[PDB]
Design a protein around this ligand. Structure first.
Ligand code: SF4
Ligand code: SF4
Ligand code: SF4
Ligand code: SF4
Ligand code: FES
Ligand code: MG
Ligand code: ZN
Lengths: 208, 690, 86, 125, 96, 115, 77, 48, 117
């Protein structure tokens, strides 16, 4: 491992693995998986019903005190029965550590709002609802935050087209801005960049 | 059973004896690097890129050529195999030219990709590189031999697949060069495939040069309509324009190859195109007009005449949707004269029994036959991929081939029995010793071409072939569902038309001349204005201006096969659909939509309004047209053979002479080919060569 | 009233088409002997009921079902269609 | 706490897609064919969903390629054919599914290149 | 080497010119049509053929790292001259 | 089988009741929207547009979808009442600038290739 | 290289706008301090990772070596 | 450019021009490619 | 190193440097380059269309660093404001004219900076 390769830290790896097993032992009702990545990032995969308990634990336990919510977001994977995965990034200042909590939902299953655990979640949840269509139960005021008023659809979904469905212009007959079906003078050029000849043998999937 | 156990990176797998290390690694999901190895070519072992380590063996082995042994543990990602790959790539790149920005294989190069995946990222070659002179092998394959890496894929393909021994290596050592050693054009119906098999930019497509990059193109998986094989293809498009045609893999039809016509005749889609409706002006000249006017003029005559006064002829590139739409439109006026240009004898069963006009053995079944008899056909130019399958079976299965007809060159040695149709009678009687040859066979095959059916002896020829097949089945017994009898077709629209109830041939027009005539892409010229009464109303619907358009009163511009989702049935009886690659130019429309709009304007509205409803109608008329990869069917040979013995038409004293006598007759066969400038270049090159 | 063509859509393996298949392999030839100018198209269904289609003048069509019919029954149905009797 | 409803899933009214881009389109579900120019097979592993091709015309200024259908560049990736069918069905798109094409196993023998009496003997190597 | 259309428009080095029936010509009224006067094909056609006493020559376009990738050109064929695939310069062996 | 977590309604009747409440609220609001935005439409056609937008989703037989639709409609009503929308957003429901599209087979044949 | 430079972190006491303004001014001063240290300890060597499968080769290498041209082509396409 | 002048090329503009926007000399964009699809030309003689 | 108005360059013989590899078109983050190519009358690999939409361009300079033959460059000129949107859609003739206009300064700048590239 000469100067072009990123150095690795075994002590942090061991510490994060130990804390992951600790968390899993404490909350076996909700934890389904624990992982530590090769660049020393710990993630915990939980059942959706445990969003409020688990987070509360990680915020209030003396051995965790993850008091900061760094980020809350969603990822859309159409091939899964539960389309959306919800990712919470937490920072602990007492122990100078970071953790990630993942759960899942589909287009019709509500997720509990975590504003009672972290005040920062409020706008984040709004953003998720705006961009993916995930509903959060018991949210103080859930509504659109990024899209235009009356905008239809959720643009961060994979099946949503890049340029959308409508475009805006000014019309002098009705003397106002109007929305019309989108027409592009130059269509966006789709590129097929992926090569054959797989790059990484370590991630090869079984040929099933 | 007899399977042996081997290990790939410690994972157990059972393989058949004689399996190579490369195939065992394939069974696990690992693709070994390769340059010279190809699945459909013979093993070479030159490039040494497949070298891999076997556990507890000091020397690496060539995975493409070495059979695996019981207990072997193949280490695909071991340090020794990685270093072997790096060294081989270093040697390959030492003399390679820095041509990537000007090389047409830039974004789709196996050399580039395997260098990025398995080689080093830098060079330590401090010498000058070798440069060789380019060779000229015709107007289709552009040659830049400094990019050659000497994998000998083209030589093996030319010798084994194409049956042409023109390519070789001259010289020795570092200056050993691939070529012909003399000024010689490599001309064959399958010559363009060496572009695809060549891993580098040494061999490229000349008409495609410098037009696109592989990352810009959009891929449409579709069907070729240049013959009746139905080879699967990929149309490459960019910004609404067709750029090139590539083969799409289908193990049962064309494996991995296409014909030179299929590959290069797309040039003709850009010339002599029909773009707007046209009508005759007061001077008598064709002038542009709207869809409303042309459709109203056609509908007025469709309303004025009925019964046997209305007729239609279907050309060679017509889809099943348009065929059934025109048939319904003419039935609504009480007309039954729905004809095709290609003649099939209607005596006996005719088109009532499907197996009477199909390649019942199927294309793949040729690999199971041990004897084949060709009657009055040139499969080399009528059905190049069928002939390639015959060549493959001849090479690998020791297939015996005999031919009735002119002694054409088929790229393999066959037994010429003669030129006279009466020879069939002798074989049908048992005097000829080839009757004894066919009697001893376990899987005999008799193939009769439609070109021998067009010669007005078609009834007698078909009866003689059926008699031979019946004698085979009666003497050798029923081996199984082997389906000896076969009919090899030439045009892509014939089987669908016969399935839908079109009368084969144009004799019904001659018997009862019509006063309104529909030409659905008909460009064979078998009907002239002389064979029709004065002031006959002729409508031409199609996509090209050819012999069919200038004789018409109204021109309705249709869509080509790259511009619609359409159903075609190949010579086996297998239905396949194309997809829309681009849209029709100008005011041209989908053909079934044209017929439906005409029916609505004429007061005879057809029940269907969408493509799905047209396919439902197709299912109602012939339900095999909506099963899109199925080839299996019933065998009614006994009924057809019993019905073929009623009429006793005599044979002519006229030798069977196929229309495609030599390669110069292969390039121009349809309106798209005749508009192709590349086909014109090919004809010029083969007629006079430089 | 003028018959133009008839269509028989039978399936290869399903038992419901069994009798229909029998009819063909037993009697179709004789039928084609009596009607040398009538197109009797034989086509293949798949997981569908057996059917008989009859086309008359000006494109009118009538279809009847042949599910579980025997050879005698399909012969009677075909004679009824050919004669025109209800 | 559980409705226990029994009905096919349909989220068409919630996705904001215009009406004529639901019941008029035809999606294709398929494993893409290998590019014949290359030998690598890594692009023939997953299932793709892609929409039907619509009209492309020439821009009167500058001659660019113009389109009016918003789904011309939309391609979705799926692990199995069943996942793609489920997605298309719940999204209200009519689909055509093509079965995966797999290269059949081949018998390869280097020794057959030099045959005593078969036709497989090669004239050059 | 610019030419002129039968209408009066200048023909570009790509051969572009609106035909007589084209309405798009209207964009040039009261204005001009931008045409580059130096045609690269004619300019590269005027370069003299270089003479080298070797079977293989190398070309990088001049200027070293300021040129193009270095390529090697074979000069065994006496019928024609070797042409660089980037630069267009020509080379030949001293025939006679 | 197929037990699922509710959003708001245990069955179809509760969803219908929520739909009726939302419709009542929109019907009450329409005249205020017409007056306050200084629109050029009448109250009658505003209420007709509300009814049409409700009838567009009348085929839904799933309570979760129904009350998600109700949540979205309540969001839209809250946007309208608080005058967070402009006149352009309100007028977008009527498409007064979009050219009429023929549903006839012949007209679509004449205009282009689009089915 | 942050762990190789020394600086102080300004900390407020009342959590209002005035303390945040003071903190921002102090961070400007500490940035000057860090910039001085960075100027004095700038080391020699290359400026991108010597791994041509990630970082593009030099133009001269691209125009002289086959692997460099291939890696440039692939990295930029 | 007095002490060291630019390299002389025969394709370099001998007369510099300023910004000619809002002037009959302004640049007007246009397509530089040829027509893609060629139409069929009817014969000049009648059929009957 | 300043990035300004784009230009197309040529060799000292007057032959254009561009050989239509489409690397600049592939790398353009804004999809502002449109290229069409074909063999020339002398068999040379050249472009028939080279368009840059200057109202889509972000002036990042990725195209000039992707170019293998120094064909497309970002020049030193920045005073090219326009009274219409149309004149900011550059075709090949405009870019060749810009190269012929600015080659002296472009060559001097490239000579000054190429040892860092
Ligand atoms: S063959 Fe491949 S590696 Fe060689 S110049 Fe062409 S694209 Fe580059
Ligand atoms: S021309 Fe291509 S296929 Fe033939 S030996 Fe050379 S690299 Fe191999
Ligand atoms: S500067 Fe950047 S955005 Fe502009 S054309 Fe070049 S690569 Fe594209
Ligand atoms: S400007 Fe340069 S990068 Fe762009 S196509 Fe031309 S040679 Fe290739
Ligand atoms: S692939 Fe085995 S040596 Fe070439
Ligand atoms: Mg090649
Ligand atoms: Zn050069």
């Amino acid at each position: 491992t000469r100067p072009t390769i990123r150095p690795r830290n075994d002590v942090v790896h061991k510490q994060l693995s130990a804390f992951g097993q600790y968390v899993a032992e404490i909350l076996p009702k909700y934890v389904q998986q624990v992982q530590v990545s090769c660049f020393n990032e710990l993630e915990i995969f939980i059942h959706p019903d445990g969003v409020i308990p688990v987070l509360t634990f990680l915020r209030d336990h003396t051995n965790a005190q993850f008091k900061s919510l760094a980020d809350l977001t969603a990822v859309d994977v159409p091939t899964r029965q539960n389309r959306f995965e919800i990712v919470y990034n937490l920072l602990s200042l007492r122990f100078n550590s970071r953790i990630r909590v993942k759960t899942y939902t589909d287009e019709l299953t509500p997720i509990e709002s975590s504003v009672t655990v972290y005040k920062a979640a409020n706008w984040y949840e709004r953003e998720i609802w705006d961009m993916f269509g995930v509903f959060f139960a018991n949210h103080p005021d859930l509504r659109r935050i990024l899209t235009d008023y009356g905008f239809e659809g959720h643009p961060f979904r994979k099946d949503f087209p890049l340029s959308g469905y409508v475009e805006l212009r000014y019309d002098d007959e009705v003397k106002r801005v109007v929305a019309e079906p989108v027409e592009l003078a130059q269509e966006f050029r789709k590129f097929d960049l992926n090569s054959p000849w797989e790059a990484f043998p370590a991630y090869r999937q079984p040929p099933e | 059973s007899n399977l042996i156990e081997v290990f790939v990176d410690g994972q157990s797998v059972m393989v058949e004896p004689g399996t190579t290390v490369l195939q065992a690694c394939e069974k696990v999901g690992m693709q070994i690097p390769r340059f010279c190895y190809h699945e459909r070519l013979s093993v070479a072992g030159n490039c040494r890129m497949c070298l891999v380590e076997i556990e507890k063996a000091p020397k690496v082995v060539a995975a493409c050529a070495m059979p695996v042994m019981k207990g072997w543990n193949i280490l695909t990602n071991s340090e020794k195999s990685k270093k072997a790959r790096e060294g081989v790539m270093e040697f390959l790149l030492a003399n390679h030219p820095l041509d990537c920005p000007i090389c047409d294989q830039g974004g789709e190069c196996d050399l580039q990709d395997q260098s990025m995946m398995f080689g080093s990222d830098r060079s330590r070659f401090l010498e000058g590189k070798r440069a060789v002179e380019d060779k000229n092998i015709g107007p289709l394959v552009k040659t830049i031999m400094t990019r050659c890496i000497q994998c000998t894929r083209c030589i093996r393909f030319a010798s084994e697949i194409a049956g042409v021994d023109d390519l070789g290596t001259t010289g020795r050592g570092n200056d050993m060069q691939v070529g012909t050693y003399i000024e010689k054009m490599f001309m064959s119906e399958l010559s363009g495939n060496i572009i695809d098999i060549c891993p580098v930019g040494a061999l490229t497509s000349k008409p495609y040069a410098f037009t696109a990059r592989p990352w810009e193109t959009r891929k449409t998986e579709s069907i070729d309509v240049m013959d009746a094989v139905g080879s699967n293809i990929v149309v490459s498009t960019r910004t609404g324009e067709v750029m090139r045609i590539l083969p799409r893999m289908h193990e049962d039809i064309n494996e991995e190859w296409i014909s030179d016509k299929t590959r290069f005749a797309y040039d003709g889609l850009k010339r002599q195109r029909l773009t707007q409706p046209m009508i005759r002006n007061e001077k008598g000249l064709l002038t542009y007009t709207t869809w409303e006017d042309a459709l109203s003029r056609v509908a007025g005559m469709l309303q004025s005449f009925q019964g046997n006064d209305v007729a239609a002829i279907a050309g060679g590139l017509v889809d099943a949707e348009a065929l059934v739409a025109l048939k319904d439109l003419l039935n609504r006026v009480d007309s039954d004269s729905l004809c095709t240009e290609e003649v099939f004898p209607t005596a006996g069963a005719g088109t009532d029994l499907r197996s009477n006009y199909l390649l019942n053995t199927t294309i793949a079944g040729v690999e199971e036959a041990d004897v084949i008899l060709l009657v009055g056909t040139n499969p080399r130019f009528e059905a190049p991929l069928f002939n390639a399958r015959i060549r493959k079976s001849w090479l690998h299965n020791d297939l015996k081939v005999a031919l009735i007809g002119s002694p054409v060159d088929l790229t393999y040695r066959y037994d010429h029995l003669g030129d006279s149709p009466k020879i069939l009678q002798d074989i049908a009687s048992g005097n000829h010793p080839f009757s004894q040859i066919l009697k001893e066979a376990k899987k005999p095959m008799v193939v009769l071409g439609s070109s021998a059916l067009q010669r007005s002896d078609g009834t007698a020829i078909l009866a003689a072939v059926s008699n031979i097949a019946q004698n085979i089945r009666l003497s050798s017994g029923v081996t199984g569902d082997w389906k000896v009898m076969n009919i090899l077709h030439r045009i892509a629209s014939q089987v669908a038309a016969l399935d839908l109830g079109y009368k084969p041939g144009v004799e019904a027009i001659r018997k009862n001349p019509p006063k309104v005539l529909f030409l659905l892409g008909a460009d064979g010229g078998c009907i002239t204005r002389q064979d029709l009464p004065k002031d006959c109303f002729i409508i031409y619907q199609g996509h090209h201006g050819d012999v069919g358009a200038p004789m018409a009163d109204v021109i309705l511009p249709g869509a080509a096969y790259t511009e619609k989702s359409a159903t075609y049935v190949n010579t086996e009886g297998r239905a396949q659909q194309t997809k829309v690659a681009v849209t029709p130019p100008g005011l041209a429309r989908e053909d079934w939509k044209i017929i439906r709009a005409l029916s609505e304007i004429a007061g005879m509205t057809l029940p269907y309004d969408t493509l799905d409803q047209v396919r439902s109608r197709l299912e109602e008329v012939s339900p095999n047209l909506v099963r899109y990869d199925d080839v299996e069917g019933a065998n009614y040979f006994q009924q057809a053979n019993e019905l073929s013995k009623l009429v006793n038409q005599q044979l002519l004293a006229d030798p069977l002479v196929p229309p495609q006598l030599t390669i110069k007759d292969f390039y121009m066969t349809d309106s798209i080919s005749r508009a192709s400038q590349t086909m014109a270049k090919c004809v010029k090159a083969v007629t006079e060569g430089i | 009233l003028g018959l133009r063509e008839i269509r028989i859509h039978l399936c290869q393996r399903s038992p419901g088409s069994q009798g229909v298949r029998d009819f063909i392999e037993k009697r179709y030839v004789e039928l084609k002997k009596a009607n040398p100018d009538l197109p009797i198209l034989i086509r293949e269904c798949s997981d569908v009921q057996p059917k008989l289609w009859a086309r008359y003048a000006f494109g009118q069509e009538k279809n009847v079902s042949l599910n579980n019919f025997s050879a005698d029954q399909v012969t009677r149905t075909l004679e009824n269609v050919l004669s025109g009797k209800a | 706490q559980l409705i226990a409803v029994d009905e096919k899933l349909d989220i068409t009214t919630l996705t904001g897609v215009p009406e004529e881009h639901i019941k008029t389109r035809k999606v294709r579900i398929f494993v893409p064919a290998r590019n014949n120019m290359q030998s690598g097979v890594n692009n023939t592993k997953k299932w793709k969903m892609e929409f039907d091709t619509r009209e492309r015309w020439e821009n009167p200024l500058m001659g660019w390629s113009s389109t009016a259908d918003p789904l011309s560049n939309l391609v979705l990736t799926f692990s199995t054919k069943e996942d793609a069918v489920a997605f298309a069905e719940k999204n209200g798109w009519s689909f055509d599914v093509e079965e995966r094409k797999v290269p059949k196993p081949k018998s390869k023998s280097y020794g057959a290149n030099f045959s005593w009496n078969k036709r497989t003997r090669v004239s050059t190597k | 080497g610019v030419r002129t259309s039968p209408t009066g428009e200048k023909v570009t080095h790509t051969g572009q010119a609106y035909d007589d029936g084209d309405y798009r010509r209207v964009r040039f009224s009261d204005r001009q049509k931008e045409v580059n006067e130096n045609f690269a094909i004619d300019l590269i056609a005027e370069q003299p053929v270089s003479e080298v006493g070797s079977r293989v020559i190398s070309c990088d376009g001049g200027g070293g790292a300021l040129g193009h990738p270095r390529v090697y050109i074979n000069l065994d064929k006496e019928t024609k001259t070797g042409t660089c695939g980037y630069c267009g310069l020509q080379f030949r062996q001293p025939h006679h | 089988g197929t037990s699922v977590k509710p959003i708001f309604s245990r069955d179809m009747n509760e969803a219908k009741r929520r739909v009726r409440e939302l419709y009542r609220a929109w019907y009450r609001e329409v005249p205020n929207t017409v007056h306050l935005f200084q629109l050029d439409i009448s109250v009658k056609q505003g209420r007709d547009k509300v009814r049409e937008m409700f009838m567009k989703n009348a085929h839904v037989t799933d309570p979760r979808v129904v009350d998600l639709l109700v949540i979205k409609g309540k969001m839209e009503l809250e946007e309208t009442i608080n005058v967070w929308k402009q006149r352009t957003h309100i007028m977008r429901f009527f498409h007064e600038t979009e050219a009429p599209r023929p549903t006839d087979f012949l007209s679509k044949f004449y205009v282009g290739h689009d089915p | 290289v942050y762990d190789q430079v020394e600086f102080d972190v300004p900390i407020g006491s009342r959590g209002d706008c005035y303390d945040r303004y003071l903190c921002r001014v102090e961070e400007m001063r500490q940035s000057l301090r860090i910039i001085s240290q960075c100027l004095n300890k700038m080391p020699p060597g290359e400026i991108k990772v010597d791994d041509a499968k990630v970082s593009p080769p030099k133009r001269a290498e691209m125009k002289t070596s086959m692997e460099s041209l291939i890696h440039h082509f692939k990295l930029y396409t | 450019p007095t002490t060291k002048p630019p390299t002389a090329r025969k394709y370099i503009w001998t007369n510099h021009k300023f910004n000619v926007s809002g002037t009959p000399q302004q640049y007007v964009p246009y397509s530089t490619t040829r027509k893609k699809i060629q139409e069929w030309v009817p014969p000049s003689t009648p059929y009957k | 190193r300043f990035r300004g108005e784009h230009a197309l360059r040529r060799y000292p013989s007057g032959e254009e440097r561009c050989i239509a590899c489409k690397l600049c078109e592939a790398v353009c983050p804004a999809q502002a380059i449109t290229i069409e190519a074909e063999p020339r009358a002398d068999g040379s690999r050249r472009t028939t269309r080279y368009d840059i939409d200057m109202t889509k361009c972000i002036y990042c300079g990725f195209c000039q660093e992707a170019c293998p033959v120094d064909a497309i460059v970002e020049g030193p000129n920045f005073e090219f404001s326009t009274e219409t949107h149309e004149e900011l859609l550059y075709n090949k003739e405009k870019l060749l004219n810009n190269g012929d206009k600015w080659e002296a300064e472009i060559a001097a700048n490239i000579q000054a900076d190429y040892l860092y590239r």
